[PDB]
């Protein structure tokens, strides 16, 4: 057990230890302080008999000569287990709910491995979010990554909560899991999530990794990797279908920048690091299916919609690595539409792989395609009312008007605690489709 009283240098959160041997890059370290306190860290650089490490909790209060250093012989690891279901941890996987400490099956490098490109399987089947606005129009596929963009306080977190609550798979789902990763959020929003997961018993099929706004930013960087490590464990080792929700990934980028600034690095645009894109990719590529295995990993990263027109690197960088965009508007949150979903810019580029027979009612694609045009032209009818009231164009456009407001009234309004089955969603859909005459739809049944 390597324990060294050879701390040579402390500069901010960084330590230099000399006269060491056998130390490896990105190996974990334990600082044993002069007062009995224990802090943990990670080696960042290693050279001859010297090692530079960063302490997660910082170095305030350390006395160099009278503290010691242990190199643990492994990198950041998740002790994985089937008994993580129902449990709540911190951003480093340490137990947070006062339950028993889990005795792991094994320990996994939270970095994961890169799938062989020919071994990967295309996302091709359907989920039950319970959300008509998406299940129908902006369909989620097992293995997809579909982000959520919304402004602060416009029910975004509630959307997260109910997607996590109602998400399931119709055909013999081995088990539909949710792994929840909170990324640098306040105690109040985190307490919201934990308590909602327990009122409704969603906790019973969920794993939770809670990193808070005042936790170390380096832990904040480690959090999504641990969530996804448990995700891949359950998926491709327990045969389970895993839904992974990460709230305010906007806080991830910031932490990255912070860490990169603390580490004397070369700035990209707006101080963001020169590997920001690559890190986001290392996370987002960890979704999908693997040929010849039952499990799946599906990602919903949840981000705050940027105010500034000029996008920070954060959403553009997310932009092309993802397979869609879901959008919330505060317009609708004030307009009484509880889930503030504008289905106009909403897109799921893999939705065709979710619809169809044996996956849903066969009408799915055709009905969907009439609804998009109908809502857009009904909104056009509603906006047309600008200095051109009821007298202007009172027929055909005006009958669409009514279709556009009642669409919101219940199809989008839903209820943050109403799980609308897919057959429910489409039966309600055809009911809404009846409103306008059969001649508008070039569609044939």
């Amino acid at each position: 057990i390597k324990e060294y009283r050879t701390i040579k240098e402390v500069v901010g959160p960084l330590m230099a230890v000399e006269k060491v041997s056998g130390v490896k890059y990105e190996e974990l370290i334990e600082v044993r302080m002069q007062n009995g306190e224990i802090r943990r860290g990670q080696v960042l650089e290693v050279q001859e008999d010297k090692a530079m490490v960063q302490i997660f909790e910082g170095t305030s209060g350390i006395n160099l000569k009278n503290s010691s250093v242990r190199f643990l012989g492994h990198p950041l690891q998740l002790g994985v287990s089937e008994d993580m279901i129902g449990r709540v941890f911190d951003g480093l996987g340490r137990p947070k709910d006062n339950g028993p400490e889990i005795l792991p099956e094994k320990y996994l490098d939270i970095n994961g491995e890169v799938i062989n490109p020919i071994a990967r399987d295309y996302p091709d089947e359907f989920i039950q979010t319970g959300i008509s606005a998406i299940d129908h129009l902006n369909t989620l596929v097992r293995g997809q990554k579909l982000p959520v963009f919304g402004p602060p306080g416009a029910g975004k977190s509630a959307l997260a909560a109910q997607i996590a609550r109602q998400a399931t798979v119709l055909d013999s789902s081995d088990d539909f899991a949710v792994v929840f990763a909170a990324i640098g959020i306040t105690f109040e929003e985190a307490e919201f999530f934990m308590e909602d997961f327990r009122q409704t018993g969603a906790i019973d099929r969920s794993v939770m990794f809670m990193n808070l706004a005042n936790d170390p930013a380096i832990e904040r960087i480690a959090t999504p990797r641990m969530a996804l490590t448990a995700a891949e464990y359950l998926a491709y080792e327990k045969g389970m279908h895993v839904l992974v929700i990460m709230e305010d990934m906007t806080n991830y980028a910031e932490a990255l920048r912070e860490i990169s600034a603390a580490r004397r690095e070369v700035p990209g645009r707006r101080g963001y690091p020169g590997y920001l894109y690559t890190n986001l990719a290392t996370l987002f590529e960890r979704a999908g299916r693997i040929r010849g295995l039952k499990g799946s990993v599906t990602q919903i990263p949840i981000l705050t919609m940027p105010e500034d027109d000029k996008t920070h690197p954060i959403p553009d960088l997310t932009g092309y690595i993802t397979e869609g965009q879901i959008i919330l508007t505060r317009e609708l949150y004030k307009s009484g539409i509880s889930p503030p979903i504008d289905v106009l810019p909403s897109l799921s580029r893999l939705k065709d792989k979710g619809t169809g027979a044996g996956k849903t009612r066969e009408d799915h694609a055709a009905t969907m395609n009439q609804l998009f045009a109908a809502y857009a032209q009904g909104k056009q009818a509603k906006e047309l009312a600008v200095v051109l009231g009821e007298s202007a164009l009172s027929d055909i456009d005006k009958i669409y008007a009514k279709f556009a407001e009642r669409f919101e009234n219940e199809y989008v309004n839903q209820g943050f605690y109403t799980n609308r089955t897919i057959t429910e969603t489409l039966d309600l859909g055809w009911e809404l489709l009846a409103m306008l005459p059969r001649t508008e739809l070039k569609r044939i049944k």
């Binding site: 056998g22 490896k24 970095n111 799938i115 490109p117 020919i118 990967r120 690559t278």
Partner: protein, 584 residues
């Protein structure tokens, strides 16, 4: 032979002492895992190595050994219809040898099957004096393509022993006596991927390449040996225009390079290419293709080396006398890989953080394509045609990689998502895309087709550009408030767009349009404008012409679907004339 010792591990950089026997750019195996890396610096006996894989868990005291050579590819039988990663590791063999679904660190695997037997037939008489590029023999590697065994560069002499038979790529199939002694040849040769393969003479790419796609074959053609840049917005059908070019172009092989794509897009590639059918032979297009596959999360070095591996393979098959097409999708990712690696090295940036050498690098790549005379006595002729997707994160075309690409390539195919939004496939922006081959292609097409095809193309575009101008005016004042001539131009432009520019790649006939077919089709479209303008000359009102000629212009719309064996489109011209004469 020499065992170096790690003294420093920092990020993707490793430093190792006792390496004085190695060379700059030598590949080497670092650490106990033997992770692959590149010697980029040397100070005394201490080498600075650029590690290709992740270095987590490595530290000083571990050994380092150089493979004695720079990043290379194996070139021989076993290469066609295979799928590799950026440094030519065979993915399928990777799974079976590792018994794993993942790319583990530090496992080294030959690129070709050194144990599969091949039938080699000799083609040159024992005792004939030869040189680099001379074809010695021949292996029918694949159902469609024949692998011509050629003498490696740096070999000259008299072929001494040559006997046909069944060998592995490791067996001596030939013995040649050189001034430097007696040297044995096999079916495989290796080449460093950042050296361009030697040639005898670079030539002008003046022969147009038949894509079968009317919009580009007519207005924005690329020649055999040319290079095109294709910006690709989301949901613009770029994937199928690349499929169409790969499937219909009159080239011998295709090399497709992944260049760090999202894994799902990449597996779409891996799935759809084998199911694309060669028209000439009906076998899988993969028979005719080499695929390099790289995902966004793979090692950055492999994503940067991907295009060089690809272009080296393309030069290999160009040296055989074949025409090759290298598609890189997308070079934007390749250049982000270049940028990340440059910044990680603490180099002085260039425009938007890309290295200062970005420009040069792109040049070195695209100037390796082209039409060449290969080595060898027969002086055979080959070509590489480059089709590179550029697709910047920022929608702005104005970005260092796109503009640095456009200054060394001559044809630019601008995909437009709002054009795909209007259901216009292929979604090629007709006013902003361009080709500097158009004049030389006119000179060729005119001579072989014995018609004023060049003047026809120039006029079709003339009215299309003029349609842009007129449509702007129409925004200000409605179409009613325009001259009768101008609506006629707009209406023949309608047929240019709908009846010529639009193609459904999935229709059995419309998927490919021949030389003659395109000529006759645009022929009839243009004669409509000619004769109707003579009618306007005669005073007749344009609305009357539209009403009178209703059936025949519907036949002109259905023109794209008349089979290739029959050619009824010519007759249409006469009908037009006669009908407008009835209108008087």
């Amino acid at each position: 032979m020499q065992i170096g010792k790690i003294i420093k591990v920092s990020g993707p950089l490793v430093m190792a002492e006792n390496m004085s026997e190695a060379s700059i750019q030598d590949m080497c195996l670092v650490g106990d895992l033997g992770v692959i890396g590149e010697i980029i610096e040397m100070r005394q006996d201490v080498a600075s190595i650029q590690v290709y894989e992740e270095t987590s868990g490595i530290g000083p005291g571990e050994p380092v050994r150089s493979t004695g050579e720079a990043l290379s590819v194996e070139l021989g039988p076993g290469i066609i219809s295979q799928m590799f990663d950026g440094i030519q590791r065979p993915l399928d063999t990777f799974m079976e040898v590792t018994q794993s679904n993942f790319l583990g660190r530090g496992v080294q695997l030959p690129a070709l099957d050194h144990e599969k037997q091949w039938w080699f037939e000799a083609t040159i008489e024992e005792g004939t004096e030869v040189s680099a590029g001379d074809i010695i023999g021949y292996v029918d590697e694949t159902k469609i393509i024949q692998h011509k065994i050629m003498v490696p560069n740096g070999i000259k002499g008299t072929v001494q022993k040559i006997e046909s038979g069944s060998f592995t790529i490791d067996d001596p199939i030939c013995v040649i006596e050189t001034e430097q002694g007696l040297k044995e040849l096999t079916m495989m040769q290796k080449w460093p991927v950042r050296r361009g393969r030697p040639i005898k003479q670079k030539l002008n790419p003046d022969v147009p390449m038949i894509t079968g796609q009317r919009v580009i074959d007519t207005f924005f053609p690329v020649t055999k040996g040319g290079a095109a840049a294709v910006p690709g917005p989301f949901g613009a059908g770029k994937t199928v225009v690349q499929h169409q070019i790969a499937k219909w172009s009159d080239v011998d092989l295709v090399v497709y390079v992944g260049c760090g794509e999202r894994g799902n897009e990449m597996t779409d590639v891996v799935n759809e290419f084998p199911e694309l059918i060669d028209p000439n032979t009906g076998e899988s297009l993969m028979e005719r293709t080499v695929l390099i596959a790289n995902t966004s999360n793979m090692p950055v070095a492999a994503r940067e080396a991907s295009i060089y591996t690809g272009i080296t393979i393309a030069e290999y098959f160009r040296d055989m006398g074949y025409d090759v097409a290298i598609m890189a999708d997308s070079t934007s990712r390749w250049a982000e890989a270049l940028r990340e690696m440059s910044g990680r090295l603490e180099e002085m940036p260039g425009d938007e953080g890309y290295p200062a050498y970005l420009g040069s690098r792109l040049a070195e790549y695209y100037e390796r394509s082209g039409r060449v005379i290969a080595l060898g006595s027969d002086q055979r002729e080959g070509s590489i045609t480059a089709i590179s997707a550029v697709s910047p994160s920022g929608g702005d075309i104005s970005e260092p990689v796109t503009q640095n690409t456009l200054r060394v390539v001559k044809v630019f195919w601008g995909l437009d998502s709002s054009l795909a939004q209007k259901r216009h496939f292929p979604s090629i922006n007709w006013i902003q895309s361009y080709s500097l081959y158009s004049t030389e292609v006119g000179r060729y097409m005119d001579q072989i087709l014995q018609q004023d095809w060049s003047d026809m193309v120039t006029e079709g575009m003339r009215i299309l550009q003029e349609e842009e101008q007129l449509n702007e005016i129409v925004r200000l004042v409605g179409i009613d408030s325009l001259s009768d001539n101008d609506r006629l131009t707009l209406e023949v432009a309608k047929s240019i767009r709908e009846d010529y520019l639009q193609q459904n790649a999935f229709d059995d006939v419309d998927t490919f349009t021949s030389r003659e077919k395109q000529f006759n089709m645009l022929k009839v479209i243009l004669t409509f404008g000619k004769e109707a303008r003579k009618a306007l000359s005669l005073g007749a009102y344009f609305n009357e012409i539209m009403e009178g000629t209703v059936a025949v212009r519907e036949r002109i719309s259905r023109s794209k679907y008349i089979p290739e064996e029959e050619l009824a489109k010519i007759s249409s011209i006469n009908e037009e004339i006669k009908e407008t004469i009835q209108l008087i």
